[PDB]
PDB file of C-alpha atoms and ligand atoms in Angstrom:
ATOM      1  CA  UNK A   1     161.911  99.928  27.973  1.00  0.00           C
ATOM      2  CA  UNK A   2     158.499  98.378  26.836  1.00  0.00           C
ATOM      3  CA  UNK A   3     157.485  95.452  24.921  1.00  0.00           C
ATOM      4  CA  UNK A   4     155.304  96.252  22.026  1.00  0.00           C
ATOM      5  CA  UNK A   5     152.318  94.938  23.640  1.00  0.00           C
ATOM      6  CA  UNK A   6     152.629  97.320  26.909  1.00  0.00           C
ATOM      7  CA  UNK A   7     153.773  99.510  24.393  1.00  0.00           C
ATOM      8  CA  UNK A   8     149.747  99.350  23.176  1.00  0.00           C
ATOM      9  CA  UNK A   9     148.098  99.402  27.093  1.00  0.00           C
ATOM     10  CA  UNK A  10     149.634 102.124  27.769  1.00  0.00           C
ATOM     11  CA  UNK A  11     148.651 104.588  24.610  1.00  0.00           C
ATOM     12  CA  UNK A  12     145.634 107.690  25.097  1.00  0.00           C
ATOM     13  CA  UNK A  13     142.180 106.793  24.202  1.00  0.00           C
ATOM     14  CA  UNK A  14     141.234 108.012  20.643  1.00  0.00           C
ATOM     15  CA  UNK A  15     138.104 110.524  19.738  1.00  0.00           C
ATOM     16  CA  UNK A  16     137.606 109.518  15.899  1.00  0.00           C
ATOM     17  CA  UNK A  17     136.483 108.250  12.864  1.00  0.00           C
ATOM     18  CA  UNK A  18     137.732 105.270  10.863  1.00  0.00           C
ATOM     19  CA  UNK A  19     136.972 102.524   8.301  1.00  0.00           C
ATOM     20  CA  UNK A  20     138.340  99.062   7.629  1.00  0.00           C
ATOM     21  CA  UNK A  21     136.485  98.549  11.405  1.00  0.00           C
ATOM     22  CA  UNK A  22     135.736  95.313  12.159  1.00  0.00           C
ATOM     23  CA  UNK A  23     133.474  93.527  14.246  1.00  0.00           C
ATOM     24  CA  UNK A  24     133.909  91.304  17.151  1.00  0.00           C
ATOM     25  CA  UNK A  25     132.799  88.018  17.911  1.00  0.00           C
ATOM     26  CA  UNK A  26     131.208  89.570  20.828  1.00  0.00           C
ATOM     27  CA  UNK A  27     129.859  92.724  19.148  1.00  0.00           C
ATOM     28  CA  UNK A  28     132.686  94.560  20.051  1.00  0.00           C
ATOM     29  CA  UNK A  29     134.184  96.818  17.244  1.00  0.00           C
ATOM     30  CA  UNK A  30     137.385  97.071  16.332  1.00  0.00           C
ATOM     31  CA  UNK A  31     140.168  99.099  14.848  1.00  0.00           C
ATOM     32  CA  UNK A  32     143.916  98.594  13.902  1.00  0.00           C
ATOM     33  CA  UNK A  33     145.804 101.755  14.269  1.00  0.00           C
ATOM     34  CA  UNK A  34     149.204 102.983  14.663  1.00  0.00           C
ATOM     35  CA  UNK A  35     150.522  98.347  15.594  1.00  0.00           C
ATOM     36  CA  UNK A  36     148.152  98.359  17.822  1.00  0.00           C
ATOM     37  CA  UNK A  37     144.177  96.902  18.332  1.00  0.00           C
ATOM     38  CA  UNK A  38     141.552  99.709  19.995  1.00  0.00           C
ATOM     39  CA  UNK A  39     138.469  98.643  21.058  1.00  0.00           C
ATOM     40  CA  UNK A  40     135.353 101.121  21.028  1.00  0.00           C
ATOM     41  CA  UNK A  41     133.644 102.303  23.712  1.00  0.00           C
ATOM     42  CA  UNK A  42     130.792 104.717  24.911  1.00  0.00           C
ATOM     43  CA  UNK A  43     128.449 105.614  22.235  1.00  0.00           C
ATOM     44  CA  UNK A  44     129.491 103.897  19.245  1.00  0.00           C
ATOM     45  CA  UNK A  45     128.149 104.641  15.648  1.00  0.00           C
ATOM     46  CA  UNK A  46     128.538 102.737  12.484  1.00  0.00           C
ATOM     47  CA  UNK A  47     127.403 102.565   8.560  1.00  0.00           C
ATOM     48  CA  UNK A  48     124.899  99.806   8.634  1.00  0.00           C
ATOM     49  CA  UNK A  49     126.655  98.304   6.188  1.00  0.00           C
ATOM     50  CA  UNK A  50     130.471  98.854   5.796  1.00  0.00           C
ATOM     51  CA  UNK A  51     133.526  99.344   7.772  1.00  0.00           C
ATOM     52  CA  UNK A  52     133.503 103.147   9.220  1.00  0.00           C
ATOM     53  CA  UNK A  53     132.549 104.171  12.845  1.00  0.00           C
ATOM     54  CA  UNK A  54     133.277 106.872  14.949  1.00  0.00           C
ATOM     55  CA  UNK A  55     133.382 106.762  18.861  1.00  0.00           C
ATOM     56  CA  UNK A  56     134.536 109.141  21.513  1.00  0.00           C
ATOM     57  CA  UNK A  57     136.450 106.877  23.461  1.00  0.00           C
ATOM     58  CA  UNK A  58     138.712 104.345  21.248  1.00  0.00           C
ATOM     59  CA  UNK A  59     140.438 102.582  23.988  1.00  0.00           C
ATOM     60  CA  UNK A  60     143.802  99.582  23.479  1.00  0.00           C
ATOM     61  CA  UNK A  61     142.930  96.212  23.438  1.00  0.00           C
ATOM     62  CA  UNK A  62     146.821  95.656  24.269  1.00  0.00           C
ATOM     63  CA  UNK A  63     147.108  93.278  21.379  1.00  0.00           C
ATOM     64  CA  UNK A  64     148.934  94.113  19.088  1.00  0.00           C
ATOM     65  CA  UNK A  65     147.607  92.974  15.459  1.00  0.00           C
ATOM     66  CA  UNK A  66     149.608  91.420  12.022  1.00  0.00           C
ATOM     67  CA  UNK A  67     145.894  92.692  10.041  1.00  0.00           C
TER      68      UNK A  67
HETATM   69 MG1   MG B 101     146.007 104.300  29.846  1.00  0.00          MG
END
């Protein structure tokens, strides 16, 4: 009995690899996966140019994304 944004906070962490990633404001890189936002953490690597990264540790942002 969850909305769809606890719904997100409460989901595992991810170990993976995806494109259409995209960066943060704040550096931060970003995924949409499943209706809901992860944020990467811990050792984070990227294409220099282009959309895929993988990282151990893809954690919810809790917001839940319409991109
Ligand atoms: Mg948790």
């Amino acid at each position: 009995e969850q909305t769809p944004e606890e719904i997100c906070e409460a989901k595992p962490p991810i170990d993976g690899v995806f494109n259409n990633v995209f960066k943060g404001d704040e550096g931060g890189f970003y995924i949409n996966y499943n209706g809901c936002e992860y944020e990467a953490t811990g050792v984070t690597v990227c294409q220099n140019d282009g959309t895929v990264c993988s990282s151990s540790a893809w954690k919810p942002t809790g917001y839940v994304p319409e991109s």
